[PDB]
């Protein structure tokens, strides 16, 4: 995937290649900047589904905002379309199915636009004609606008031709009907993308504050160490949770520091208990880290 | 005239049903075609004729109308025009498209800053059958044993 | 809302394609900033000519401001300065706040001011500029977009504008106008407000002085507690002030941690003494945080 | 400087519009990076073929460098490798520094190299490349912009060029040239320097070893005071070094904090032992700090 | 880096697999040579037609040489002879060292010469040749690779090429150019000189 | 006997000659290496014969290298 | 067991043809090496990270090895490094011999590791790598073959693996692990052992020093012949050590001849004093040969 930045001379032909390559470069630059501060500048920002038809084996997305591993930003609110409804009838046999958002891989050799024909390789782009209002003047007209060939796919089926990112997990309930997993977390780009995590984080802060206030009132270096750790962390953790619209890496580090300090005096916990950060599988990062922190706070 | 043809399947290695070199296989992205097209190059000596040949012009339309019958489905024809830069319009934007509006990849030549040489521009391509997909596989077939 | 155009063979050239392509690129830049920053908007620089202030004229000389909707205004790099604000109409006030205003985008178009008047302001201006080509040697006139920037009073109706504070004016002893020496707009860089930089420098000075005294005295437990807190913070806070070109959120966290630890020593101060971060009204964040830190260090 | 084009219904399409639009977008991207990073520039990759050094030739294999003015050079994705540098001309030297040079942009135009004579270097090259259209299947030749990259010696006049260090060469035992095993260019990512990366990994390992023994052992107040510092630092240092694709400023701060705390215990090593961060010359930043940390932990 | 291809059922057939495989095999052969030989590279043949020296032209007839980086040049079997060297620009000299130059590899691709010009010389050239199938009784035209070889003088800039001495020319008593009777190329085979 | 180094061009017709030439080159290269150290890099490695039927005018090999 | 393909006329593009050609090519190259050298295999490089030994872990940093069946491993150019070796289960021992292991080829297939469990270790791994074409500009992904290398202990069952020594660990006075200061693996390239380089350098120095003394000085028969022996041997030994990148067999022969002659002057020792060459255990070859030569030269 080479990018051929165009040159504009005294006089020349305009070409599709100039425009396509220039756009590619600008996307590349944006991605390059993100990577200066964040190891994993991709993931889910938002994901919402209409569960009304879920009892009838239909998974209907209502809003998806996902940044893909290769700098491509999908936003069905601002500049894209929602995927077709996923039929769960074919996975009735299973008690659990994971669903991912799939985006067809770019073909370096062209043929990326979907012309309505069938082929082995899924097409990436679609052409939709819409009425676009000119900003400067008062006229509007039809313009060919690029849309992405988004689709929801079963996580367990072959997905070789697609770049994928998890959006939801479904399980079978007591009544045998499909429902959403109460504790599923996709790769997150922003904390606000997963309400379940936000709730647990809020609870942690509450307990932390309560522990702090009680200990502060009751006033051996152990006392001061535990209190210092609480006082040091709280002013920062609070701000992070008040404005939950930033990459998890920032939160992880603050929580990790807190766990690290607390484990200094614990004599029943493993100093290596703190999990490594994993972007793809956040479920194995935050839920256990938070559980550890809760136990450490209780063990005063 | 050379055209690139997409492949239905890529060239791969197999054990049970391997490809024989008798098929003269090529790598899996695109094959060449030098038996499907001819190139028809035009050249004019006046602005009137040029405008007529440009997309939206009456000569462009008439030529395709004649090819429709004269060549029919036998061959496709690639059309291009070679004329002095002085006979071409300066690419300009418009809030509304038009038949005579310059096209991005064919005629949209930018204005020169008072730096005529001959410019080659595209006119279009003649093709009757678009090869779109409506096969509707099959339910039955002619099956006499005879 | 944003239509990413499909560039392809046979396509026509329409202004919508270009306007929409640009909008998307701006969006992407904004999206990236938000990955690390809660409030990626505010003032980078703002300078005014005080010379005519005694005669009710506020004449800006330099403005670099990132607006809440991703719009970047830079009168040094790629824009024009706003018209001079006439302060005569507010001569009956002892204090007035000045904001930089940029008219809101019209979703229905008509965003370009062609000289026609209406009930709603427009933000785009058309200027003809003789712009030098880079590749070759020739030069010619092109249509350049400038922004309809204006200085408005904070107390005026501003529903039709997107605004950001730039300066505050007060009446002096002689009744003349003068600038308020203790005013802080929403910032993207620390250097954007000299008043703050001065206070930050003083903090570092006092911190270092106390650190040195404590080191000399090497109650042993108490001394270790405090030295650890100070020695940990100093190597970081210094670097942040040495290169004062970073979003304030970064400074806040570093200072907040220090205040947090120090409040474990001084019982007379409530833990909640540390203010929450507020981007819109930084005057209620840094000045009191710094005051608290100074008191904690003095003690 | 930058004249953002105004796209209008009746506007003509002129080269200047495209050149200015591109300039703005680069500027905007740079502005965003600058919100969190004091020095958003430096080396990402600087690989050379060592096998030709014995034959007095320096042939770059992969260069990724972000220049001081927001320009990104990438020979892996969108540019060409520089001409082979002849080391024959420095036969009288035992140590030479190599910098990657990029000619300054001329505000007055004449930036494109048309093969004519010039007293100053050109910045842009024009290459003809048959480029594939992504939407359809057809392809056609376009004018591709390539940069006039070249390797120059540090001791040469470089007034007309932007420069960034990429490698240092020294004499081997046989008098032949070889690459200096301990050289660090201005870094944009940690992975750009295997030398530094190796030492950083070693530091973490030493940190862990000391942690473990203190953790095993559990007047003992000094154990707890120190152990806390180690337990606090490790969970973060580990992450940063595990996946080494972050701007050095982030690592510096973490390492500095650790040194800060450790210098609260040591008496021999002054608090001021921690070096200031310098982006241009990391060689005077990291190897000092790392040595200090190793001594403090070993003690 | 060399990426040995993984051959398996269902795998795609790609030109990259072949190019990487070739590189590996050359590397392996070079490794073996180095087990016993300190300097595997050197000249095997450097035969020139010196009858044209009186007319300021140096024309190689058979060149065989292994380069410092394992590249093997074989005029007799696989490679073409370089263009004839014009000595008219050597008028003011009495002694010239001639080397065979070979452009060095571009790490990021673009090694094949497509007829365009560039700052750094291309290494490979594509030619069409008639090749007989050994098994059967048929011939066809196929594409083959040749090295972009050329003769250059030692006093010229040679940074962009790997070089190996092949001949030395000295002014004779008559003012004519001739091959120096006592010149020895770095030898790989004793019979080469 | 010429030995070509085939160009594995993408999209070109794939031919049996390309494989024959590639193999020939690799053999040539290996032979070239051997000749750098040994004047006569050829001969017998194994020549084990079955002489059990030799009394009946029949000679056969069991292993030849 | 190697079935060279027949590329004629309507040949079939089968994966077996390519695999068999590769097998032959390696065999052929190996056959050539064996014309001059008895043992064309061994270690070229074996660099390890010493900072993990305090934490009971051994991790190679650079391995270049040629196995007994022509297989060439090079983690600088084509191969990956082996997983970190956990020495915890070896703790009871005071001395540990570590070898590099590679599972034997299965003639009956199943050589590729597909992640499944099996009683016989898989030797090949499939890695996806984006590889740039050399001839043209196009860049694309291919399946790259990597060796399934691992470190194993000499005392473990190694029936299913090819293997050779790469390092030996011993416990230090403090009980911590440390690489044995005097370990030599079977060498392919003389320079592979830094300790050997040092000892050889000392020998050459002493040889030259003794030569110069006798040379300047020139019962006189013994003097002439002792000097002759040194004058003859030195010019070649020097060349062998000046560019020390040759198979050990060449050096051994040259040194052995010198020792042989020197034993004609000494009556204080045997005539079979010169050790036989052993490739697998060079430790019993060079260290005593060199010691013998040093002592004989000193005896003069």
């Amino acid at each position: 995937m080479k990018i051929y930045r165009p040159l504009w001379e005294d006089g020349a032909f305009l070409m599709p290649q100039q425009f396509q390559q220039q756009a590619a470069w600008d996307v590349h630059l944006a991605d390059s900047v993100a990577r200066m501060g964040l190891a994993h500048p991709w993931g889910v920002v938002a994901a919402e589904f209409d569960d009304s038809l879920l009892p009838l084996s239909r998974l209907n997305a209502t809003r998806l905002i996902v940044r893909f591993p290769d700098g491509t930003l999908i936003d069905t609110e601002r500049a894209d379309n929602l995927p077709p409804v996923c039929d769960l009838s074919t996975v009735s046999d299973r008690s659990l199915v994971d669903i991912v958002l799939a985006l067809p891989l770019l073909n370096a050799n062209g043929g990326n636009l979907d012309n309505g024909s069938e082929s082995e390789r899924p097409r990436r782009w679609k052409s939709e004609r819409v009425n676009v209002q000119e900003l400067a003047g008062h006229e509007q007209s039809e313009v060919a606008v690029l849309r992405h060939n988004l689709t929801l796919r079963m996580a367990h089926q072959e997905n070789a031709a697609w770049l994928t990112c998890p959006v939801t997990r479904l399980v079978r309930d007591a009544q045998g009907q499909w429902c959403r997993d109460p504790r599923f977390i996709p790769p997150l780009l922003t904390l606000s993308a997963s309400p379940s995590l936000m709730t647990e984080l809020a609870e942690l802060l509450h307990h932390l504050q309560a522990r702090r206030q009680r200990l502060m009132s009751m006033r051996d270096v152990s006392l001061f160490w535990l209190l210092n750790a609480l006082n040091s962390a709280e002013p920062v953790l609070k701000e992070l949770l008040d404005m939950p619209y930033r990459h998890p890496e920032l939160l992880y580090r603050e929580l990790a520091r807190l766990a690290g300090s607390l484990l200094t005096f614990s004599l029943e916990h493993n100093v290596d208990a703190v999990p490594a950060y994993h972007h793809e599988t956040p479920e194995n990062v935050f839920p256990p880290l938070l559980s550890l922190l809760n136990r450490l706070l209780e063990a005063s | 005239d050379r055209r690139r043809i997409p492949l239905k399947t890529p060239l791969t290695m197999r054990v049970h049903h391997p490809v024989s070199l008798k098929s003269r296989p090529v790598m899996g992205d695109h094959a060449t075609d030098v038996n499907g097209q001819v190139l028809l190059q035009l050249s004019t000596q006046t602005g009137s004729e040029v405008q007529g040949w440009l997309p939206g012009g009456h000569l462009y339309s008439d030529l395709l109308a004649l090819l429709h019958v004269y060549l029919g489905s036998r061959l496709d024809v690639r059309l291009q025009l070679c004329v002095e830069r002085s006979l071409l319009p300066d690419a300009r934007l418009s809030c509304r498209p038009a038949a005579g509006s310059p096209q991005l990849g064919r005629t949209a030549v930018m204005r020169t800053q008072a730096k005529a040489r001959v410019m080659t521009i595209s006119l279009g391509r003649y093709q009757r059958v678009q090869e779109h997909y409506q096969r509707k596989e099959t339910q039955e077939n002619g099956d006499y044993r005879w």
Side-chain angles (χ1 to χ4, degrees), chain A residues 90-119 121-156:
Chain A
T90 63
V91 178
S92 184
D93 195 64
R94 295 190 180 196
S95 67
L96 186 148
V97 62
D98 286 356
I99 305 296
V100 302
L101 176 65
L103 178 66
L105 297 169
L106 188 70
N107 187 355
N109 287 297
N112 289 289
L113 184 66
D114 186 345
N115 66 349
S117 69
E118 300 288 356
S119 67
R121 185 188 179 97
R123 300 285 176 96
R124 187 178 173 88
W125 297 341
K126 294 187 179 180
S127 173
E128 182 180 346
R129 295 181 66 85
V130 300
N131 290 309
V132 179
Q133 174 68 54
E134 182 180 342
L135 291 170
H138 298 282
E139 194 66 20
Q140 65 180 326
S141 67
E142 292 184 359
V143 179
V145 177
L146 190 151
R147 303 293 201 198
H148 284 287
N149 189 15
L150 299 169
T151 185
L152 299 176
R153 294 179 66 81
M154 301 298 179
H156 61 281

Side-chain angles (χ1 to χ4, degrees), chain B residues 8-145:
Chain B
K8 182 67 172 177
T9 64
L11 178 63
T12 66
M13 292 162 275
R14 292 189 292 269
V15 175
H16 294 84
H17 301 283
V19 175
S20 176
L21 295 180
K22 294 183 90 72
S23 296
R24 298 191 184 279
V26 298
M27 296 300 178
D29 287 334
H30 292 84
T32 62
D33 178 356
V34 296
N35 297 283
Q37 298 198 158
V38 298
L39 172 65
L40 175 60
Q41 179 174 289
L42 277 67
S43 178
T44 63
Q45 298 296 306
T46 186
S48 179
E49 291 169 355
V50 170
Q51 185 62 57
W53 287 118
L54 293 175
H58 61 289
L59 298 174
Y60 179 78
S61 180
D62 284 344
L63 180 60
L64 290 171
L66 295 174
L67 289 171
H68 185 84
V69 176
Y70 190 67
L71 265 61
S73 65
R74 291 183 185 88
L75 291 169
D76 299 325
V77 181
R78 183 161 66 89
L79 304 173
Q80 67 185 25
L81 175 65
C82 299
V83 298
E84 289 88 337
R85 176 62 179 80
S86 68
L87 301 178
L88 300 177
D90 288 328
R92 197 182 81 189
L93 296 176
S94 181
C95 68
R96 183 180 294 108
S101 177
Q103 293 178 313
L104 171 61
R106 289 92 180 273
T107 67
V109 177
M110 297 179 85
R111 181 169 170 85
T112 297
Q113 300 291 170
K115 184 173 182 179
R117 70 187 187 278
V118 176
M119 298 289 283
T120 300
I121 64 169
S122 296
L123 300 177
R125 187 173 71 191
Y126 167 77
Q127 181 178 343
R128 288 193 65 200
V129 182
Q130 295 177 9
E131 202 263 318
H132 64 83
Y133 175 74
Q134 292 291 282
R135 287 187 62 82
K136 294 178 74 72
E137 194 64 20
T138 189
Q139 188 65 50
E140 258 286 348
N141 59 272
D143 57 357
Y144 293 128
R145 289 178 175 86

